[PDB]
Structures are given as C-alpha cells and as structure tokens.
Design a binder for these strands. Structure first.
Lengths: 337, 5
DNA sequence: ACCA
C-alpha cells in the first residue's frame, strides 16, 4: 500500500517499523523528507498475512530537464534486498504509487556487492550501476559505494574507544586529549552554529560545494538528541573541529564535519573517538565513517578514515534502477560503456 | 555536489 | 598537508 502522510496513526506505524528494523536507515525515515524539503515524498510498504509491516520504501521525487521525475529511495528499501522476490513485490507497489510520473526508481541499499547478487538483479530486469561505472570515481553514484565501516560486534567487551585499536593508533587518539582538546555534544542551535562555522570553513578551504544552514536546521528539527548529535572540539575556548553523527538502525554514521583554519591539535581524532564512544555506550553494531574514492594511500579520505577502520572498506551493490521510461533513462543516465 | 547525504 |  501507499502511505497517507496525513494519517498520523498510519505514519506512526510506518515509523515504528522503520525505527525497529535491522535494515533501518536515517535516509529512509520520514524525517528525511523534511530535510529534503525540495523533493516530493511518496512512501509505500508491504504487510504480512497478519497486517504487520514487513517491508517499506521511502521515495523522494526530484525534477529533471524532461517531463519526468527522478524517484530515489536513498539507502532503501528497508527489508532484506537479497530476498529479490519480496523486493519485486515492494518495487511493484512503489511503481503503482509513482503513477507514471518518474522515468526511473533508483535505490542504493547498504548491501555488499557480489557477482551473484548483481546477476540476480539484472535477471529480474533491474539495471545496476557499480563496478561498470567505477572508473568515473566516487561520484559515479549519488552516494559513495565504497565505505569505511567499523564493525563493533568484533569487540563485544570493549568499554572505551581505545579498546578497539592497536597501540600505535591508541597514541594517535590520545594526542589531542593530551594537548588539551575537549569535546562536548548536543543537538541545539548553539552546536549547530559551531558546526556551520567549521563546515563552511572546510568547504572554502577545499573549493568544494556546501549546503545552506537551513538544511541542518531542518535536520535538527526532524531528529531528536538521541538520534542526531553534534560533537564540538575546543582547546582553551578556541573552536577547532566538529562533526555530526546520526544514530539509526544498526549504526552511528559520521555524516558531516569540518575544522577551522590554523592549528587544530588533531581535534578531528578526538571527535571520532567520542562518536565511537557514543556507539559503544549505546551498544550499536556499526560505526560508519562514510565514503572513500579508492582503497589507496593516494586517496586522502581513505588515509584519514583508515586510522579508525583497519578492516577492508565495505563495497556496496551500488545503484539499482527500475527503469520506467527507457527513452528518458537513456538520455539522462550513462551505463559506463 | 561535493558527499551525498 | 589533507584530516572532508
């Protein structure tokens, strides 16, 4: 069925499924539509024989230079996507709800790439975007397909962040604290202002693009302090570094960050240590540091994140496209050939 | 445009 | 150096 966003009882039942599923993702929460307020939300779900939700997909519809919309279910759907017969049923419900308005429904779930899964999806009629587009870089897909994820279940007895690391890394993490860096955290306008200062400073330093403050304000309005937390590192009253982490489903996800110009005393490592500590304190399975471009010392994202993730990066299946208007799909999407 | 999110 |  399609979710009626104006029925609070239905919305709460959908949210309860999303928040309690092991496949839950913050980008599939209905609060994500409030963040992405320039996109149109369309949400669908399936029920078991007793009427309980068993699978859900939160879609956001965006504009294109054509008459068609782009339908996108970020890190969805919320279910076991390797159960492809059930995936087909949910995708069929989503297609009914789109009512021919979109040229594609794209979803990019956090499931490992494998040849067997890629082949099954193609056998079921989907177009996949992964290793065939890898040569285009990190931004070949909307979200990074290679991600540095710390599996904390490998350390069931860890009490503090340092318990996860070899001595050489313990030293790297201890250094900012020894040098007077202190970290606080919260989800108020005060911490958001501190974040935004460091985030805009980082973006200007790298010549890259950056989101307006209202984006993060909508996120702070949508998610409470048990879900969204801004960590702020200072040394003797000087603001040094920040980061935003979101706790949802089985992971705490380091999403945005920045540092001020000048000497920062390794403050980003202190931010990471506290974000990891939040994961340990809440018994969360995964700490996700997010995307890299390649598993190489030439990639500075990998170098930094490899300090905290010694295992191999997780490589996901990438973008799964249910093609709805093939003429528009061919005009707007390249297949990597 | 750039890390997603 | 970057430490997103």
């Amino acid at each position: 069925p399609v979710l009626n966003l104006n029925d609070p009882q239905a919305v709460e039942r959908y949210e309860e499924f999303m928040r309690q599923s092991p496949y839950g993702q913050v980008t599939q929460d209905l609060g994500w539509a409030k963040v992405k307020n320039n996109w149109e939300p369309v949400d669908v779900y399936l029920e078991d024989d007793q009427g309980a939700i068993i699978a859900a997909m939160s879609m956001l519809l965006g504009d294109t230079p054509t008459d068609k919309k782009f339908a996108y279910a970020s890190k969805g759907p919320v279910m076991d996507v390797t159960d492809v017969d059930l995936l087909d049923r949910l995708v069929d419900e989503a297609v009914k709800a789109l009512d021919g308005r979109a040229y594609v429904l794209r979803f990019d779930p956090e499931v490992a790439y494998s040849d067997e899964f890629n082949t099954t999806l193609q056998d079921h009629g989907y177009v996949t975007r992964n290793r065939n587009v890898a040569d285009a870089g990190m931004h070949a897909t909307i979200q990074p397909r290679l991600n540095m994820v710390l599996d904390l279940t490998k350390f069931p007895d860890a009490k503090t962040t340092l318990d996860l690391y070899p001595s050489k890394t313990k030293s790297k993490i201890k250094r900012p604290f020894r040098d007077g860096v202190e970290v606080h955290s919260g989800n108020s306008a005060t911490e958001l202002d501190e974040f935004f200062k460091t985030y805009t400073t980082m973006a200007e330093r790298h010549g890259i693009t950056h989101r307006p403050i209202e984006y993060f304000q909508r996120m702070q309005a949508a998610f409470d302090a048990d879900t969204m937390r801004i960590f702020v590192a200072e040394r003797e009253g000087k603001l040094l570094s920040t980061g935003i982490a979101l706790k949802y489903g089985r992971k705490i996800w380091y999403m945005y960050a920045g540092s001020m110009d000048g000497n920062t005393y390794y403050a980003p490592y202190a931010v990471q240590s506290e974000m990891i500590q939040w994961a340990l304190d809440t018994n969360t399975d995964l700490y996700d540091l997010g995307g890299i471009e390649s598993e190489s010392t030439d990639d500075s994202l990998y170098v930094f994140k490899h300090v905290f993730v010694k295992d191999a990066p997780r490589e996901y299946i990438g973008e799964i496209d249910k093609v709805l208007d093939p003429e528009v799909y061919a005009e707007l999407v390249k297949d990597g050939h | 445009a750039x890390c997603x999110x």
